[model samples]
Target: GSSGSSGEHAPATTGPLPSAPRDVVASLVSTRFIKLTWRTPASDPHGDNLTYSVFYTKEGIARERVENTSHPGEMQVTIQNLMPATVYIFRVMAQNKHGSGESSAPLRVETQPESGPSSG
Candidate 1:
């Protein structure tokens, strides 16, 4: 794990970027959010210098940035403000001072349908 530092020992701006993340997954956490989890590549050229970017889309829609500067390895994030009952596909990429790496395979998830007004 990195010291979570951004100063000394930082990767060179022109050096090799990290590879794509692995084991990328997404699952329903609630009606409005989904939990995304992924692993850092076993071959991160910059080691702890690697971070993640989460990209997603609504089925055929263009991919959009859902997260930035996320830490590497066994990381989990709850994505919110989504359309209930809609389909979404996600991917993760590792990044370093050099540039962003390739994205992981797409993870598709369908959120739970929204219920009408509460009957409590």
Candidate 2:
């Protein structure tokens, strides 16, 4: 049976998408983790209930997800399970009830190398 378009649902609008996060930055926390932070756009036309998507990767590898905070009102997130002494590239995107916004310019960081063998 063809259900056709549901009149209950409103049609999609042609408005501009939400803005990218601001001041995207990252810092090495230890061998296997890093701390990331960013600010919401000065304006999110769609308003509250916004979440953040953290994407990162090594120089040539595909990016990986770090966090997808459901209603991430906070501005900081820590990513774990990273490879030791590795350089990672990252970006943050804002998402609202509507959809995800643009990602910021890429950020980079190198995790602390694992402690060398202790001196004998």
Winner by lDDT: 2
Q: TM-score for each prediction?
A: 0.73, 0.74
lDDT of candidate 1 at residue 43, scale 0 to 100: 70
- Predicted structure 1: lDDT: 0.71
Clashes of each: 0, 0
lDDT of 1 by residue, 32-113 (tens): 8788876658677334676677777899999576576444443666777777888888787776666676777888888888
The residue-by-residue lDDT of candidate 2 on 1-120, one tens digit each, is 343476778786656667778878874366888888777676663334688788888978885765775456657778888888888887788877656778878787888878777965
RMSD list, candidates in order: 7.1, 6.4
Candidate 2 clash total? Answer: 0
Regions of model 2 farther than 4 Å from truth: 1-15, 45-48, 117-120
